[PDB]
DNA sequence: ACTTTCAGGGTGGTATGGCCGTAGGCGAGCACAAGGCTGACTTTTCCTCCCCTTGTGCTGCCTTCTGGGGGGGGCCCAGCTCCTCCCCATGCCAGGGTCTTTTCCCCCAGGCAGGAAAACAAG
DNA sequence: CTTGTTTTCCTGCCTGGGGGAAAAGACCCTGGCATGGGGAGGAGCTGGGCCCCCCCCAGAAGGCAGCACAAGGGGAGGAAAAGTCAGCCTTGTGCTCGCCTACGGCCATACCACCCTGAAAGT
């Protein structure tokens, strides 16, 4: 149960990177339940990456190829 | 021993890019000329970036370029925002925009 | 009568202040929890690198801000400043996440 | 250990060469050799599929022209494939 | 008589939902191809095949262009569809 | 043959599309604006093909080429082989 | 080796197009017998919603509306063939509640 | 001549719908359909071997292919078939 | 229905991979503050949600007239095949030039304090 | 509109810390030699893509009636914003244990090249 460790002060801050001036009582959850399933889709490839090179560590180049597979590639931690 | 890349101009590997050619299995065979192309290709992609971020690094009075500027320089060029906009970079942020909806009258 | 901001400048002062910085905005230590407890559905028992959390972290805090944006788009097109949840899931559905 | 590889050096010496006098730091230097890597498995793998469309067995100048300029949009490709075509006759021409 | 407007509209919805063929005109869409084509490359070829691939691929991304444009008029709503949602839906699909 | 073909797509094709998107009523400017976005669509289609066909140093746009270029776009089109 | 393995699908064809692909410079014994059983699986998941779709029109021949209707109706396959145009399919009838008349 | 899988997805309909039949136009529906997912697993299995420094692509590369390009239900039953494949192959 | 093209059985080699030994770099785990961030409360102000109205643009209908669908035919350039053989790319080895890891120190970035300036809001 | 009041930005000073240069090594870049093989070119061929002819009839375009829907205006109530205060818990540091992973050595067998043929599929 640490979903909640995403705050609503750190929610509102994301948004105000986003650029959003106000923001509704039901946004939070609904902004959970979204980081919890993209977390879910680039888990579940980078533990695949992890399980297929018999490691037992995910290392950021399986975060990498797991961020890649989804079209989402990230620059900077390897490549 | 004179080196391709001296040879044409380059900076980048020519013999190592030819070398991943060839293990990357990309064709049974590869051409004399495609790891220079590539390799041209490539670094002017290099120079575009690394100027544009320099310029970013300028405009903030600053001498030592950082994730920051690469972003700032990519996400406010139109080309190489459109070459990579499914690409995120790390400690970059994001771009300085207001919706004009939203500012006081 | 003590002094008080209307309501509207704080917030686009927040805006202006974490448009303008590269760090964070998840505290690191339950962000570590969140990824942890979710790749405990995948594989148990699993060990996670520093920089595999921190380019976990940094997806996310793109992601996010991706969808903020979209979000406010959509609460502008809706003749409105505040964001809704009807608004994020009409940004989702049709940039086609999940329908 | 390992002896590991990138294109670090090079990505100095032209930026030695365009910028003589700013720097760069450590993670924008993770930071290119990500982006050199990434664009180099784009145009590598478009012009594999070039070349295995006209059922050629050898990767050329011409398919990577070709993949170039179906990656890259209006100027990118346009200043891409003439800075790969210069260097690919001045290299063979030499 | 004259049926109420809407009636009209749902029924010529469910028509061309439940039809599969081409409803764009095919000679004066082959020369909307040749018109573009014309400026990538003078005296230009082309096969049946290829124009009808062409049509089908436009014809489907319009009517899902259409979806998600639907989409944005109900967001704001309305049941007119405009401008303004077919601008909202290109730019959150993100081609502009 | 050359010159202004984009007013071939008439009214009542861009309603018929929309009826089957799902659009109950349609805007007077919905029109030049859809045919406006086929413009630049077909123009991307297009100029992808013509470059798939350059490089075969054809003279023929074929089914081949088309679904090359719009494969490479995401929209994978199916039916005409490959 | 298809009939030792048991697969309507070609192994040899699938070898040859292994080896002739350029996906690496070696290919084991396995990866073709692997493929031509996991593509048969495929085909014969959107051949036997597609020819269910058919049934549900009274006809016996399959065509690209019928594949297109299997294809957008089931969920896993509408999420892999997320970005297939499919010529001469149509599209999923679906008019929303709010425009229905009240 | 163009070899296709017309021929080979001809008899795996007999086994699943033995009654119905094919037109002319679906056949090459799938066979761009078979074609592109092809391109996918042989694709997803040749960068799996680059990461791991590997030379030779094998029934684990593929199913780790399989696997990460089929969603849910669909990697649990294609993993299932190519498994069984192997397996009777090697006996 | 024929054929012609390609996949299978057997041989030989070797190079890529499988298993055991190893040592160390980093990942997990545990205290410990303690200040910085987070949670609950309160005022209230401004935003959202409903309602009315209207005029105006959208829709349903009719009629006319076009220009797209449906063939039929000629031709002539463009895409496919076949064979030659030659120039390009490949396999192998030798030696060094370059790229790679460690060491350091100094200039650039970080923190803090002081003051000035620029917006905010009641008034 | 003045003015009090916060919040932010510039300038200066101290500091720490990480990048740019020096030094040695270790790994494959390039040159030299021998060689098979794929594609560039020339000829033949054939087929389909373009252009034109004719027709006609279904659909588009223009005009009108009419009607319902979006956009402006009004009101109110309620729900976030902003500020305040109390609490708690990230985190920066220090420290340890031990595991796992990259390397290294040796060899074991699966794969590639090749020779022939009989069978499978495409017209």
Redesign the pocket.
């Given at each position: 149960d640490n979903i909640?460790?995403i705050?609503?002060?750190?929610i509102?801050?994301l948004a105000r990177r986003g650029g959003?001036?106000?923001?509704?009582?039901?946004i939070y959850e609904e902004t959970r339940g979204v980081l919890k399933v993209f977390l879910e889709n680039v888990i579940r490839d980078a533990v695949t990456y992890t399980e297929h090179?018999?490691?037992?560590?995910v290392?950021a180049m399986d975060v990498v190829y797991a961020l890649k597979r989804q079209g989402r590639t990230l620059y900077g931690f390897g490549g | 021993?004179?080196?391709?890349?001296?040879?044409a101009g380059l900076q980048f590997?020519?013999?190592?890019v030819?070398?991943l050619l060839?293990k990357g299995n990309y064709?049974?065979?590869?051409?004399?000329?495609?790891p220079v192309y590539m390799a041209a290709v490539l670094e002017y992609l290099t120079a575009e970036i690394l100027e544009l971020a320099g310029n970013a690094?300028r405009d903030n009075?600053?001498?030592?370029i950082?994730p920051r500027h690469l972003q700032l320089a990519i996400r406010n060029d139109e080309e190489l925002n459109k070459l990579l906009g499914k690409v995120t970079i790390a400690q970059g942020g994001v771009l300085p925009n207001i919706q004009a909806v939203l500012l006081?009258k | 009568?003590?002094?008080?901001?209307?309501?509207?400048?704080?917030?686009?002062?927040?805006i202006?202040?974490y448009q303008?910085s590269t760090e964070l905005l998840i505290?690191?230590?339950?962000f570590q929890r969140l990824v942890?407890e979710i790749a405990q559905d995948f594989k148990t028992?699993?060990?996670?690198?520093?920089?595999a959390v921190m380019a976990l972290q940094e997806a996310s805090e793109a992601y996010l801000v991706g969808l903020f944006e979209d979000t406010n788009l959509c609460?502008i097109h809706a003749?409105?400043?505040?964001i809704?949840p009807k608004d994020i899931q009409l940004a989702r559905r049709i940039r086609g996440e999940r329908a | 250990?390992?002896?590991?590889?990138?294109y670090?050096?090079?990505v100095?010496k032209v930026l030695?060469q365009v910028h003589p006098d700013t720097?760069?730091?450590?993670?924008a230097?993770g930071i290119m050799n990500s982006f050199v890597n990434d664009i180099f498995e784009r145009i590598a793998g478009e012009a594999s599929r070039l070349?295995h469309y006209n059922?050629?067995?050898?990767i050329?100048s011409r398919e990577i022209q070709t993949a170039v300029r179906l990656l890259l949009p209006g100027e990118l490709a346009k200043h891409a494939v003439s800075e790969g075509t210069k260097a690919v006759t001045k290299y063979t021409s030499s």
């Open positions: 909640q460790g705050t609503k002060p750190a509102r801050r959003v001036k106000r923001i509704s009582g039901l090179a018999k490691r037992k560590t290392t | 021993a004179k080196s391709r890349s001296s040879r590997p020519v013999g190592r030819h070398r060839r064709a049974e065979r590869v051409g004399a000329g495609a690094a009075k600053k001498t030592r950082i006081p | 009568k003590p002094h008080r901001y209307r309501p509207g400048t704080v917030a686009l002062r927040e202006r202040r303008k505290r690191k230590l339950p942890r028992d699993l060990r996670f690198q520093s920089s609460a003749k409105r400043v505040t809704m | 250990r390992s002896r590991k590889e990138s670090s050096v090079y100095y030695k720097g760069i730091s450590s993670k230097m070349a059922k050629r067995s050898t050329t």
